[PDB]
Amino acid sequence: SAFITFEGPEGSGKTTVINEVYHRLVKDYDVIMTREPGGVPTGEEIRKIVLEGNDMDIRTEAMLFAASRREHLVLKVIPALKEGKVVLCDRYIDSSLAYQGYARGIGVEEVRALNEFAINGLYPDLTIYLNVSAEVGRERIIKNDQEDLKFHEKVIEGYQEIIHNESQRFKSVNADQPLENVVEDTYQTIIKYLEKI
Amino acid sequence: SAFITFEGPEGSGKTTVINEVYHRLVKDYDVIMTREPGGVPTGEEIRKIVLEGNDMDIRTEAMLFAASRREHLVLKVIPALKEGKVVLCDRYIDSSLAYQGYARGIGVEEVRALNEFAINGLYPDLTIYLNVSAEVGRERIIKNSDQEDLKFHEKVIEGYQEIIHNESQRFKSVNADQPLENVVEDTYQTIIKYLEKI
Ligand SMILES: COc1c(CN2CCC[C@H](n3cc(C)c(=O)[nH]c3=O)C2)ccc(C(=O)O)c1Oc1cccc(Cl)c1
Ligand SMILES: COc1c(CN2CCC[C@H](n3cc(C)c(=O)[nH]c3=O)C2)ccc(C(=O)O)c1Oc1cccc(Cl)c1
């Protein structure tokens, strides 16, 4: 089994990359694609609160992302890993660190303490970071707003801080390349990891 | 202003005590009494999720209590303290520490880290602990309204004892084994003594 998370800002080609990698990995592995809350009832109810809300306090929002994360982990990720599956998870702890911690200004270490309470030691076996420049990412967003551009840049700044501080489970993939190449580099990185157990 | 929380297991007479004490304090102070989620919409929605929880993971439950706590703090407690009010809050961080941390077995320090993220430095000025023995508490439970329940009740008390031993300075322990008229009087006097020193 393997718990593989995918991280990156919007415009990193993350959706395309996960779908294409899933289609190739399913040939050799029992694999699932998921994201939080991912159909878990309590997580879906939490997601409705976060969305069908207005000017929610950023720490309340962070705790709700963390609660949805735990429900998804316990009821969906862990049972799939127990079945021997390769779980491809679109966004996990690092999204809260970059978005809530860095971009929203709560502080990465404070948000880390919150998310370590939520995941209780269940860090990914491997994390693919789709390393897109702010400029390429901006173009992909318009293809697929001053405050939005700055928030997009802050998210990237946050991910850079996170990866600089920890580089073991993290594998950075050049997401400025055409998506065919991003898919190939991501697939090869995953296979290299999986074939080592 | 003053932020006063009330803590204790079930059977400590906490409901009766806070209501009576509040009724007395309003004569002399600008005071409000509240509890979580206390009508705050997001908090009420969180409460529904917790109550509808089928064998909910204890850490998810702890994060939901913490999220309800922050909504209630931000929308109700902090604005009242900014107006110079005395805020009487029925259950706060120490309920999560005793119930989620100690009794449920997550660990007090882990639940403290979670709740410190939620309250962001807003600890109570004073915490009234209604110190009832497990035996008196057990009897009040059977009067007001099994083995697993008795053990959980004892564990909650044990947790509160550990918490107060580690943070004696913030707590004022009131003998809750006394008849409730006396518990009300001792609680009221402890609060007045604190308030008249501000
Ligand atoms: C409000 O956050 C959402 C967004 C906004 N945004 C997109 C970029 C990622 C971002 N995000 C995502 C995660 C996982 C996290 O921990 N922190 C974040 O800030 C969330 C977009 C769609 C949905 C959406 O799902 O429609 C969404 O709601 C969610 C998504 C995941 C979990 C929860 Cl509780 C709510
Ligand atoms: C499931 O917890 C509840 C209980 C059970 N129990 C009673 C003893 C106190 C206990 N409790 C209370 C708080 C504040 C906390 O942080 N942790 C706890 O374990 C909660 C009783 C009534 C309600 C009730 O409100 O009907 C309730 O729901 C709540 C209470 C406060 C906050 C939230 Cl999110 C749900």
Relative orientation angle of helices B58-72 and B41-51, to the nearest 10 degrees: 160
The CA distances from residue A91 to A14, A72, B11, in Å, are 10, 12, 45
Q: Report the CATH number that the domain containing residue B130 is assigned in CATH.
A: 3.40.50.300
Q: Residue type at B9?
A: P
Chain B residue set in contact with A, beta carbons under 8 Å: 42, 45-46, 49, 52-53, 56-57, 59-60, 62-64, 66-67, 70-71, 74, 110, 113-114, 117-118, 120
Experimental technique: X-ray
CB-CB contact of B31 with B85 (8 Å): yes
Nearest to A193 by CA among A99, A59, A88, A100: A88
Yes or no: say if A4 and A128 are a contact pair by the CB < 8 Å rule: yes
B74 CB neighbours in chain A (<8 A) are 57, 60
Count up the domains in chain A and report the number. 1
Domain that holds residue A83: 1-197
Q: Residues A49, A95: contact at Cβ < 8 Å?
A: no
Nearest Cα to A96, choosing from A135, A70, A125?
Answer: A70
Q: Which residues of B touch A63 (CB under 8 A)?
A: 63, 66-67, 70, 117-118
Query: Cβ of A67 and B71 within 8 Å?
Result: no
Q: What is the spatial order of strands in the sheet that B171-175 belongs to?
A: B31-35, B86-90, B2-7, B126-131, B171-175
Q: Which residues lie below 8 Å from residue B104, measured CB to CB, with a gap of 6+?
A: B58, B61, B62
Of B18, B45, B50, B61, best ligand 2 pocket probe by most atoms within 8 Å of the beta carbon: B50
CA distance B125 to B103: 25
Residue A189 · residue A171 · CB < 8 Å:
yes
Amino acid letter, residue A84: G
Interchain pair B60, A49: CB under 8 A: no
Beta-strand pair A170-174/A126-131:
parallel
Let me know: does A94 contact A9? Beta carbons within 8 Å. Answer: no
Tokens of A107: 């502080």
Are the C-beta atoms of B97 and B139 separated by less than 8 Å? no
Q: Is A137 annotated as a binding residue?
A: no
Residue B90 and residue B6 in contact, taking contact as beta carbons nearer than 8 Å: yes
DSSP state of A39: T
Locate the chain A residue with the closest alpha carbon to B120.
A59
CA distance B5 to B56: 27
Resolution in A: 1.7
